[PDB]
Structure 1
Amino acid sequence: NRPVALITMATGYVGPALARTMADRGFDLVLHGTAGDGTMVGVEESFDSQIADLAKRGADVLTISDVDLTTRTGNQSMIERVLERFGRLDSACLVTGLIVTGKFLDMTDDQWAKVKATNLDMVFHGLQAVLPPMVAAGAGQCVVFTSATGGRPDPMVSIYGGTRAGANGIVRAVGLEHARHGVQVNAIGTNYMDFPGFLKASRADGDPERRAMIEAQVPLRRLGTMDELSSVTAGLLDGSNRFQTGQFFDFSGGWGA
């Protein structure tokens, strides 16, 4: 009678570490992500890599990789397949958004359309899909991964940070609107996290000089690890804490304080 946790984009970012710890805490898992092996873009830990490890930890796993999470149908389909496999949805970790930077006046209509689709549509359709079963069950926990930029939308990240702030605002209203049904919805916004995506984007991957310069921008003078983040995230998804909802948590080494 294990509870069920959904994790999207689970082939990279916090998904793998979160899956391991959520399995340690007695959860069955539905992992949405990108199909293929490590060579494929955006695959930091392949599905096949994880299935064996999570099985050892006692978790059943369902993988999903043929849905468009910027759309209603994609998210509705994803949840339909969760309920089909395990008849229940207790926790949901919705990873959203795609980075875009540059001068505000250089932003194209395509960049504007893309950032709305990744930073907002994923949140709107994601929440409209995970909530109904949680409300029906009278209990549920959701974490929406936005960005620490949402807490301080800065120059050169206008449309990305701004829409992240809108995502946090949606999460606040939704987290408060369904609190009375026993459902929690909170947002985590990270920055300066140590995973291949950020290292490649920041050009720190193979450059120690660049790495030191990036870390110097962080008050704690380091990059965050996925084990740390997964521990905090799991804390909001494992049922141990049921007294926070509609809130935004900065996780950027103090950068967003």
Structure 2
Amino acid sequence: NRPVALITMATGYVGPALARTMADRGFDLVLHGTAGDGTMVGVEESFDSQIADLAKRGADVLTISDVDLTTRTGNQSMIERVLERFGRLDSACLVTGLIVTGKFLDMTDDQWAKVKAWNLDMVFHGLQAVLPPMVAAGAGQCVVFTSATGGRPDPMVSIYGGTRAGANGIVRAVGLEHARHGVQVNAIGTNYMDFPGFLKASRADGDPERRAMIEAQVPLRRLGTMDELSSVTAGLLDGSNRFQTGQFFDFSGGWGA
């Protein structure tokens, strides 16, 4: 009678570390991500490499990689495939968004459209899919990953930070609206995290001297670890804390405080 957790974009970012700790905590897993080995773009840990490790921890695993999570059909199909394999959905970690920066007056209609599809549509369709089975069960926990820029939309990041703020707003209303059914929905927004996504976007991957300058912008003078982020994320998904919902938690070393 093991509980089931869903994690998306799990071939990178916090997915791999989160899966390990959720398996240690007694969960079966459903991992959505990119197919192929490490050479393919956006693949930090392939499906194959993870399955061996997670099985030793005692978790059954299902993989999904042929859905478009910016649409209703992609998210509905993902949850349908979850329920037929395991027949339940206790927790869900929805990783969303795509980074874009630049002057506000240089932004194009394509950039504006891409920001809306990844920062808002993924959240809207994602939540409309995971909530029904949780409401029907009378219990559930969801974490939506947005961005720390949503708490302080700054110049040169207007359309990206601005839409992240709207995503946090949606999570507040949704987390409050379904609380009476025993369901929790919260948001986490990170920045200055140590992984390829942030390193490339901040032009820090090339020069170690530029890395040090970027670290000097964080109050705690370092970049975050995925093991740290997974421990925090799991705390909102493992059933140990059922008294927080509709809230946004900043995770950027004090940058967003």
The Cα of 1:201 is off from its aligned counterpart by 2.0
The Cα of 1:200 is off from its aligned counterpart by 2.0
The Cα of 1:11 is off from its aligned counterpart by 0.2
The Cα offsets for residues 89-141 of structure 1, whole Å up to 9 and x where unpaired, read as: 00000000000000011110000000000000000000000000000000000
The Cα of 1:202 is off from its aligned counterpart by 1.8
Q: What's the secondary structure of 2:239's corresponding residue?
A: coil
The Cα of 1:147 is off from its aligned counterpart by 0.1
Distance 2:61 2:202 in 1: 33
Distance 2:44 2:204 in 1: 17
Query: How do 1:227-242 and structure 2 match up within 5 A?
Result: 227-242=227-242
The Cα of 1:207 is off from its aligned counterpart by 1.8
Distance 2:247 2:75 in 1: 23
TM norm structure 1:
0.99
Q: What's the secondary structure of 2:92's corresponding residue?
A: strand
Distance 1:234 1:109 in 2: 37
Q: What's the secondary structure of 1:209's corresponding residue?
A: helix
The Cα offsets for residues 158-193 of structure 1, whole Å up to 9 and x where unpaired, read as: 000000000000000000000000000000000000
The Cα of 1:206 is off from its aligned counterpart by 4.0
Distance 2:16 2:206 in 1: 23
The Cα of 1:198 is off from its aligned counterpart by 1.2
Distance 1:248 1:6 in 2: 20
The Cα offsets for residues 4-53 of structure 1, whole Å up to 9 and x where unpaired, read as: 00000000000000000010100000000000000000001111110001
Distance 2:115 2:52 in 1: 35
The Cα offsets for residues 40-83 of structure 1, whole Å up to 9 and x where unpaired, read as: 00001111110001111111110100000000000000000000
Q: Give the match for residue 200 of structure 2.
A: 200
Distance 1:246 1:46 in 2: 33
The Cα of 1:152 is off from its aligned counterpart by 0.3
The Cα of 1:208 is off from its aligned counterpart by 1.1
Q: What's the secondary structure of 2:125's corresponding residue?
A: helix
Establish whether residue 186 from structure 1 lines up as the match of residue 186 from structure 2: yes
Q: Give the match for residue 22 of structure 1.
A: 22
More displaced 10-residue stretch of structure 1: 143-152 or 200-209:
200-209
The Cα of 1:86 is off from its aligned counterpart by 0.4
Distance 1:15 1:139 in 2: 23
More displaced 10-residue stretch of structure 1: 205-214 or 112-121:
205-214
Runs of 4 or more, structure 1, over 6 Å off, are none
The Cα of 1:203 is off from its aligned counterpart by 2.3
Distance 1:253 1:141 in 2: 25
Q: What's the secondary structure of 1:187's corresponding residue?
A: strand
Q: What's the secondary structure of 2:184's corresponding residue?
A: strand
Between the two proteins, the alignment pairs up a number of residues equal to 257
Structure 1 unpaired stretches of 5+? none
Q: Give the match for residue 105 of structure 1.
A: 105
Distance 1:27 1:195 in 2: 25
TM norm structure 2:
0.99
Distance 2:164 2:200 in 1: 22
Distance 2:112 2:160 in 1: 9
Distance 1:2 1:162 in 2: 39
More displaced 10-residue stretch of structure 1: 196-205 or 181-190:
196-205
More displaced 10-residue stretch of structure 1: 158-167 or 192-201:
192-201
Q: What's the secondary structure of 1:6's corresponding residue?
A: strand
The Cα of 1:199 is off from its aligned counterpart by 1.3
More displaced 10-residue stretch of structure 1: 201-210 or 136-145:
201-210
Distance 1:106 1:4 in 2: 44
Distance 1:202 1:115 in 2: 18
